[PDB]
Antibody
Framework: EVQLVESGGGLVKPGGSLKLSCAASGFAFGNYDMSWVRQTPEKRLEWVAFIGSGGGRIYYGDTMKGRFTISRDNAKNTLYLQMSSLKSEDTAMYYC????????????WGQGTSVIVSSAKTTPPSVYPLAPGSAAQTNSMVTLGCLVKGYFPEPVTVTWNSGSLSSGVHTFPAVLQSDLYTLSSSVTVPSSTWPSETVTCNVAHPASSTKVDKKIVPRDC | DIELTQSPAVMSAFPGEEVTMTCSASSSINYMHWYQQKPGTSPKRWIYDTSKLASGVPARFSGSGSGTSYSLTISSMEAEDAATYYCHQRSIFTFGSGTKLEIKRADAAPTVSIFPPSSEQLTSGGASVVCFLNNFYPKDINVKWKIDGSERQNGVLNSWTDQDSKDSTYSMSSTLTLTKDEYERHNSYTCEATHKTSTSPIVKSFNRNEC
């Protein structure tokens, strides 16, 4: 029933601005105090802003320094957060939350909306097949991979045979090399089934709206 | 101001054990709350008002404390309890930094494999050598790279996965990035894993001038 759905996140340059929204369903939105809480890339949680049922009382967190503005429209069951003069340390996941009673625990949370503040620009990935080659294996199982390099921003989603190959998959967290992310994914299959039966990795980058398939084929030596 | 710290930062236990984690305050405050988070999803209300369980919380969980010290306790821990737990209270700007509870299991050596740079990455002037270390335990593990008989530790990046949902193992990638010229200038590439399942390392290698 109770639903908290957030929107408005994205990538912005330092100094810029962005307005986040949080639509509500399932309860009497006007009866409840609401807040925004943010989680930094370091998984640090900070109380960014608070607003009472009526919108008459407001609080902001310590490092906010005048650059945030929280508001609400109890006629459209929507909570807002306007951010100004953004800094890199304002990069975080931003959550819309609801308060329970006057000790101020937070009994419902939204799904989150991601805010990234940097001068970097959106870049599609490169996708390279990882076949064994000069390092051929010789047991009952064989491990293959795909290398995903040079994309911005996160995230990417990796699948194998369009999701059919799900067991035996390890997709590792991306790492930032020079404002560009790099990631690898491995899959293990029976030695008897490759290349007898094809293996393809599927890479999707939503931000650049790119889709690419890479078949894993034995090399020419 | 009034600020919170948590201890321990990381801990692991077998299912069936008692578990306790502590949250302390620089001065006296009351009505402490506790939130549960698992990777990829939002924090979730778990305990509130120092001792009240939120809905859907097993009775194995309990919260207590007063003044400057509070704790969260779990009897007969279950695998599903594994998560990060954060404390917070109505007068605090920054949440406590969290206790991450992980699952203890039987030791296991990694499955290791190494991959030379792909032909198409070479065509673009770059050369990544990739080494996977899959399904080991505990998380602590050492990887060494040797090029042509010499040890190398410059262009290496290491990345671990979260503890696995199904079997509680860890996997990691270890990537050595070079340009094409430096790759073309050496022949033997070795990836070496020293774990505590093994006084003797696990070794995987290739020669560039083959294939």
């Amino acid at each position: 029933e109770v639903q908290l759905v957030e929107s408005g996140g994205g990538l912005v340059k330092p100094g810029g601005s962005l307005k986040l929204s949080c639509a509500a369903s399932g309860f009497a939105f006007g009866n409840y105090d609401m807040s925004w809480v943010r989680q930094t890339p370091e998984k640090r949680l900070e109380w960014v802003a608070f607003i009472g049922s009526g919108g008459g009382r407001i609080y902001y967190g310590d490092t906010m320094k005048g650059r945030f503005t929280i508001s609400r429209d109890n006629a459209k069951n929507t909570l807002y957060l306007q951010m100004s003069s953004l800094k890199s340390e304002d990069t975080a996941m931003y959550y819309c939350t609801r308060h329970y009673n006057y000790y101020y625990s937070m009994d419902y949370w939204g799904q989150g909306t991601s805010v990234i503040v940097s001068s970097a620009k959106t870049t599609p990935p490169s996708v390279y097949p990882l076949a064994p080659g000069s390092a051929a294996q010789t047991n009952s199982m064989v491990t293959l991979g795909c290398l995903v390099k040079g994309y911005f921003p996160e995230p990417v989603t990796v699948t194998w045979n369009s999701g059919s190959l799900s067991s035996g998959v390890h997709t590792f967290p991306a790492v930032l090399q020079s404002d560009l992310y790099t990631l690898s994914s491995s899959v293990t299959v029976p030695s008897s089934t490759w290349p007898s039966e094809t293996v393809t990795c599927n890479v999707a980058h939503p931000a650049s709206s790119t889709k690419v398939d890479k078949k894993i084929v034995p090399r020419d030596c | 101001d009034i600020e919170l710290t948590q201890s321990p930062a990381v801990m692991s236990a077998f299912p069936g054990e008692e578990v306790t984690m502590t949250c302390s305050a620089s001065s006296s405050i009351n009505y402490m709350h506790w939130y549960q988070q698992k990777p990829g999803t939002s924090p979730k209300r778990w305990i509130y008002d120092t001792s009240k369980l939120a809905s859907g919380v097993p009775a194995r969980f309990s919260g207590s404390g007063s003044g400057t010290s509070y704790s969260l306790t779990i009897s007969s821990m279950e695998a599903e309890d594994a998560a990060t737990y954060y404390c917070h209270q109505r007068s605090i700007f920054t949440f406590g930094s969290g206790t991450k509870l992980e699952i203890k299991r039987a030791d296991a050596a990694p499955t290791v494999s190494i991959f030379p740079p792909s032909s198409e990455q070479l065509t673009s002037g770059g050369a990544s050598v990739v080494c996977f270390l899959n399904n080991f335990y505990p998380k602590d593990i050492n990887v060494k790279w040797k090029i042509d008989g010499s040890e190398r530790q410059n262009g290496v990046l290491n990345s671990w996965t979260d503890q696995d949902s199904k079997d509680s193992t860890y996997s990691m990638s270890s990537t050595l990035t070079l340009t094409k010229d430096e790759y073309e200038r050496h022949n033997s590439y070795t990836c070496e894993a020293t774990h505590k399942t093994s006084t003797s390392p696990i070794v995987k290698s290739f020669n560039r001038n083959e294939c």
